[PDB]
Amino acid sequence: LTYGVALYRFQALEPNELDFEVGDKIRILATLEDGWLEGSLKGRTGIFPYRFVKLCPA
């Protein structure tokens, strides 16, 4: 029920990272340690920094 709107481009480098562009709407799956979140976008799941998105209720 929580989604993150990307404010910054996040180029995935690690295999478990979620790649996204500004304006992409990411479904938040979990809040991880050290400022990372797990999310889903276009059928893909991965981790990304919380600071790159704006969280919205939904």
Curated annotation (Swiss-Prot):
Q: Which parts of the chain span the membrane according to its record?
A: none
Domain of life, per lineage:
Eukaryota
Tissue-wise expression: Detected in heart, brain, lung, liver, skeletal muscle, kidney and pancreas.
SH3 domain location? 2-57
Localization per Swiss-Prot or TrEMBL:
Cytoplasm; Golgi apparatus, Golgi stack; Cytoplasm, Cytoskeleton; Synapse
* Signal peptide residue numbers: none
Disease field: Cataract 48: A form of cataract, an opacification of the crystalline lens of the eye that frequently results in visual impairment or blindness. Opacities vary in morphology, are often confined to a portion of the lens, and may be static or progressive. In general, the more posteriorly located and dense an opacity, the greater the impact on visual function. CTRCT48 is an autosomal recessive form characterized by infantile or early-childhood onset.
What this protein is reported to do is described as: Plays a critical role as a guanine nucleotide exchange factor (GEF) for CDC42 in several intracellular processes associated with the actin and microtubule cytoskeleton. Regulates the structure of apical junctions through F-actin organization in epithelial cells. Participates in the normal lumenogenesis of epithelial cell cysts by regulating spindle orientation. Plays a role in ciliogenesis. May play a role in membrane trafficking between the cell surface and the Golgi.
Quote the subunit structure annotation: Binds DNM1 via its N-terminal SH3 domains. The C-terminal SH3 domain binds a complex containing actin, tubulin, Hsp70 and actin-regulatory proteins, such as ENAH, EVL, WIRE, CR16, WAVE1 and NAP1L1. Interacts with FASLG. Interacts (via SH3 domain 6) with WASL. Interacts (via SH3 domain 6) interacts with ENAH. Interacts (via C-terminal domain) with TJP1; required for the apical cell-cell junction localization of DNMBP. (Microbial infection) Interacts (via SH3 domain 6) with L.monocytogenes InlC.
Designated name of the protein: Dynamin-binding protein
Specify the species.
Homo sapiens
Q: Which residues of the full protein are shown?
A: 246 to 301 of 1577
